[PDB]
Symmetry: C6
Subunit: 30 residues, 6 copies
């Protein structure tokens, strides 16, 4: 299960990276 588990952990982190960048864009737009 190691390859499937590593891909699921990359997908969880990718979602959190997208959300943090939406918050950064909003802060910079005022």
């Amino acid at each position: 299960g190691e390859i499937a588990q590593a891909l699921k952990e990359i997908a969880k982190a990718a979602k959190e990276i997208a959300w943090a960048l939406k918050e950064i864009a909003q802060a910079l737009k005022g």
Copy 2:
């Protein structure tokens, strides 16, 4: 299957990350 579902979620997050960074670039350009 789990590999395809994780890769589809990474592709959706990658498109959201690209859009947020294009908004950040435009804010910093004025």
Copy 3:
């Protein structure tokens, strides 16, 4: 299949993320 299609979409978004970050670096240098 869906695995190859998701990886082609991640490659296309990665190139857009690289371009936006090069524009952010130039804006922060003036």
Copy 4:
């Protein structure tokens, strides 16, 4: 083997990238 090892290293780096971007978001919000 080598695919699994490289994916485990990408997952660990992705979690640190997410954490750093949450810190950047919080800094700009406050």
Copy 5:
């Protein structure tokens, strides 16, 4: 084939993302 080609394109974009983020860190440290 197309899976190896997409991963090679992701590798090149990742290197360009790392270059740009190092430029951004240096500009903010100025």
Copy 6:
């Protein structure tokens, strides 16, 4: 083969992206 080599290059670039983002976070926090 070529799949493992591309993933090893992605892992190395991801570690440098994490480092650069921690530098950015520290600079912004002062």
